[PDB]
Amino acid sequence: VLSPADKTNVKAAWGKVGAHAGEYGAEALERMFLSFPTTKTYFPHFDLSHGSAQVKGHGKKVADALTNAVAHVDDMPNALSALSDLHAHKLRVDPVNFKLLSHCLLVTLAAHLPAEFTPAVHASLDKFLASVSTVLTSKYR
Amino acid sequence: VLSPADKTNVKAAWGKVGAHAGEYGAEALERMFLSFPTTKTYFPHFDLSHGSAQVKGHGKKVADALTNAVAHVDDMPNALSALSDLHAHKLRVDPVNFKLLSHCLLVTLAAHLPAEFTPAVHASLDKFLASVSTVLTSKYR
Amino acid sequence: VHLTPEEKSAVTALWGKVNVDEVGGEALGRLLVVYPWTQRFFESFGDLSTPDAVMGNPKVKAHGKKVLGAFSDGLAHLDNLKGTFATLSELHCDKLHVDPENFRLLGNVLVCVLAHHFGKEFTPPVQAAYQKVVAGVANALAHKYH
Amino acid sequence: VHLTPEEKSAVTALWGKVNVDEVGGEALGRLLVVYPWTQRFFESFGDLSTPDAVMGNPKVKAHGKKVLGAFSDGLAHLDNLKGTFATLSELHCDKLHVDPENFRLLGNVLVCVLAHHFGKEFTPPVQAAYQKVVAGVANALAHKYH
Ligand code: HEM
Ligand code: HEM
Ligand code: HEM
Ligand code: HEM
Numbered sequence: 001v002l003s004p005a006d007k008t009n010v011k012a013a014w015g016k017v018g019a020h021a022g023e024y025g026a027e028a029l030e031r032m033f034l035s036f037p038t039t040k041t042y043f044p045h046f047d048l049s050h051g052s053a054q055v056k057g058h059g060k061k062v063a064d065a066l067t068n069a070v071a072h073v074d075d076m077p078n079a080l081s082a083l084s085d086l087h088a089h090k091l092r093v094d095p096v097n098f099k100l101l102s103h104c105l106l107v108t109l110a111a112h113l114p115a116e117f118t119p120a121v122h123a124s125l126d127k128f129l130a131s132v133s134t135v136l137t138s139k140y141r
Numbered sequence: 142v143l144s145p146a147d148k149t150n151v152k153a154a155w156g157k158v159g160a161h162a163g164e165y166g167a168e169a170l171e172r173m174f175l176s177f178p179t180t181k182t183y184f185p186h187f188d189l190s191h192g193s194a195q196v197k198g199h200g201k202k203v204a205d206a207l208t209n210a211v212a213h214v215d216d217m218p219n220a221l222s223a224l225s226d227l228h229a230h231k232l233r234v235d236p237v238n239f240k241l242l243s244h245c246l247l248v249t250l251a252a253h254l255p256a257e258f259t260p261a262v263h264a265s266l267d268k269f270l271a272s273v274s275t276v277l278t279s280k281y282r
Numbered sequence: 283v284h285l286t287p288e289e290k291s292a293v294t295a296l297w298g299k300v301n302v303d304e305v306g307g308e309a310l311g312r313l314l315v316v317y318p319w320t321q322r323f324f325e326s327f328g329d330l331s332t333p334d335a336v337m338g339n340p341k342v343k344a345h346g347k348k349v350l351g352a353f354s355d356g357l358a359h360l361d362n363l364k365g366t367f368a369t370l371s372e373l374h375c376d377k378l379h380v381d382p383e384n385f386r387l388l389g390n391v392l393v394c395v396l397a398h399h400f401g402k403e404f405t406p407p408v409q410a411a412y413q414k415v416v417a418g419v420a421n422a423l424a425h426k427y428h
Numbered sequence: 429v430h431l432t433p434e435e436k437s438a439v440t441a442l443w444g445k446v447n448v449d450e451v452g453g454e455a456l457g458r459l460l461v462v463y464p465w466t467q468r469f470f471e472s473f474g475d476l477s478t479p480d481a482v483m484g485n486p487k488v489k490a491h492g493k494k495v496l497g498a499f500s501d502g503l504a505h506l507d508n509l510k511g512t513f514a515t516l517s518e519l520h521c522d523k524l525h526v527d528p529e530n531f532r533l534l535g536n537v538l539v540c541v542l543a544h545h546f547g548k549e550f551t552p553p554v555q556a557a558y559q560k561v562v563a564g565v566a567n568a569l570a571h572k573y574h
Contacts, residue, residue, distance in 0.1 A: 001279075027552070030552045031552045031555055031556075034552045034553060034555070034556040035552070035555055035556045035559045036559075037427060037428055038381055038382050038383070038424070038427055039381075041375075041379045041380065041381045041427075042379075042381070044379045088319075091322075092319035092320075092321070092322035093319075094319060094381050094383045094384070096383055097381070097383075103536060106540055107539060107540055107543045107550075107555060108543075110540050110541075110543040110544040111543040111544065111546070111547045111548070111550055112547070114544055114545075114547060117544055119457060119458050119461045119462075119479050119482070119483055120461065120479040122458060122461070122462055122540065123282075123461050123462045123479070126462055127282065138142075140318070140319055141264070141268065141316075141317070141318050141319075168406070171406050172406045172409055172410075175406050175407060175409070175410040176406075176409055176410040176413045177413075178573055178574055179527055179528050179529070179570070179573055182521075182525045182526065182527045182573075183525075183527070185525045229465075232468075233464075233465035233466075233467070233468040234465075235465065235527050235529045235530070237529050238527070238529075244390055244393075247394055248393060248394055248397045248404075248409060249397075251394045251395075251397040251398040252397040252398065252400075252401050252402065252404055253401075255398050255399075255401060258398050259333075260311060260312045260315040260316070260333045260336070260337060261315070261333045263312055263315075263316055263394065264312075264315050264316045264333070267316055281464065281465055282463070282464050282465075
């Protein structure tokens, strides 16, 4: 459960992402494909080369969804509804993979907003990313 | 989430366990200790020999708890409220360990109830055990 | 795989009692029923809408027997699993695009199947050996992933 | 683990820039804050009720320095992490009773601290190599559990 302190922190760090959100999503992706090559099994149709347009483009999609989750941290299920359906009924990404991407987002953030990535903020972001994965995997069965 | 069908399947198969719950709980525990040796790190005070009375006593407690969750399939978070506090604040069992026990619980029922362990029931019981695990680890952080 | 000669005796001994075609179509069916997201690879198989539709599906059945047939040959090379499954690993990675997690899920389901079928003959120490075996097969099938 | 010579040279060259005392204190501290349940093994350390108390705890950074020191020294025995950690593995199993899943948690926490400290130098390719290293260390630390 995201406590009031968590929401505060998540809203603080994400606020410091701003216009770079699309870039961080794209960095998170490259990190994941490289660190966990099994994840590439879901993007056979992508060009996975460094700086591919498909990757960059996709990085922003994910980024925007996260921002939307943050703006709606209090009503996550209803905000991510359509995406929950999407992943559960079409994409069918195995739940374990959400943990891999979540990690790469943390790394990306850590390497970009050093002052803000304090231990407690680190804790908050991890809880938040866990909540979002939980929301996207809730309609699986 | 547990659909009405899942609830009926769970009530039906647990009903069959009847008085053999404790015995099945103990067996599940022995199956986990053998197949997943790392799980033994949480019972370093326990006698773990074939037929250990400590293991038989714990199997019963676990079994009793599952029976209580089935009896309250409609309000599990509250029916298992005490155990959540316990696992979160005192025992602190890493969440991955619930997956291992759940699986051994499933093998034990599979081995004792071949008539009722259909793919439909198998599916429902797996979801049941998962939802119990989630309730027991909800207050960890 | 690290299996003691009592664990290897146990595995082979019980496998000798297994009906591969039957057990294969059974493990694959329950996988598709219990973890429905796994269906993402079988849309050419037809109707997988209900448990009975999945289980009685002749394409599901024919494929489960093919999968287990392969598994069985792995069983004759516990000391050379990587080598045995080398070509299949490349196939599932490069051509099929199967996330390795799927192999681990099938392994656990298989274990529930052997238990359902052998009853008390599937003792705690026998399960422990099979778990090392299914883990070994999952790792071998995923070794060529890149 | 097998790191390509250009992967090993990327690991090695960043490790030379590491202040082990600080980083080890940062890594173990964060582990206890992000994942509170890991605190079960460290209750005699004192007050860990708040993040600041955890980060400030003398016993914690002293232990962190202890742990990362071991890690550090293993990075030179990359060729044989199993033999390098064989005795420590027995100790965490038989004496300390540490669930190996904790080695994985720490490993990921460590990778986050490095990124936090090296920012732009911790490139995706460099992160990829370190992920292999921490998975290798976690696997070596657990090989002697029974
Ligand atoms: C933090 C969690 C994640 C979020 C917020 C998320 C969000 C999104 C969004 C918004 C889309 C685009 C849908 C559209 O076209 O409107 C998408 C597509 C997709 N996601 Fe997820 N996703 C997440 C995790 C994952 C993971 C872990 C994987 C697998 C490794 C994944 C694989 C896919 C795939 C394959 C697509 C479709 C790509 C395409 O063909 O364009 N997603 N996701
Ligand atoms: C979903 C299954 C689980 C249920 C229903 C469950 C239930 C219980 C219950 C009823 C107790 C006894 C409470 C008391 O009176 O002290 C307990 C204790 C305990 N559980 Fe859990 N538990 C579950 C899973 C786990 C797992 C996965 C582990 C570890 C691998 C674990 C480790 C412990 C330990 C160490 C104790 C204390 C044993 C003792 O000292 O007597 N539990 N659990
Ligand atoms: C225990 C491990 C497994 C073994 C030993 C195995 C074996 C096989 C074999 C021998 C083939 C046919 C090769 C060919 O067509 O040239 C194959 C194909 C295939 N496997 Fe696997 N497999 C395994 C697990 C799985 C699992 C768990 C999935 C995914 C849920 C999977 C999905 C597929 C698919 C999609 C095909 C192709 C079916 C078609 O359209 O013809 N396999 N596998
Ligand atoms: C992956 C890296 C790890 C390595 C290489 C490692 C290494 C060490 C070393 C060198 C010691 C010193 C023991 C002695 O002086 O005899 C130690 C002790 C200990 N380790 Fe680990 N450790 C690791 C991870 C962890 C984790 C994740 C935990 C638990 C969350 C843990 C818990 C302990 C405890 C409790 C002690 C203190 C024992 C005492 O107070 O006597 N270690 N570890």
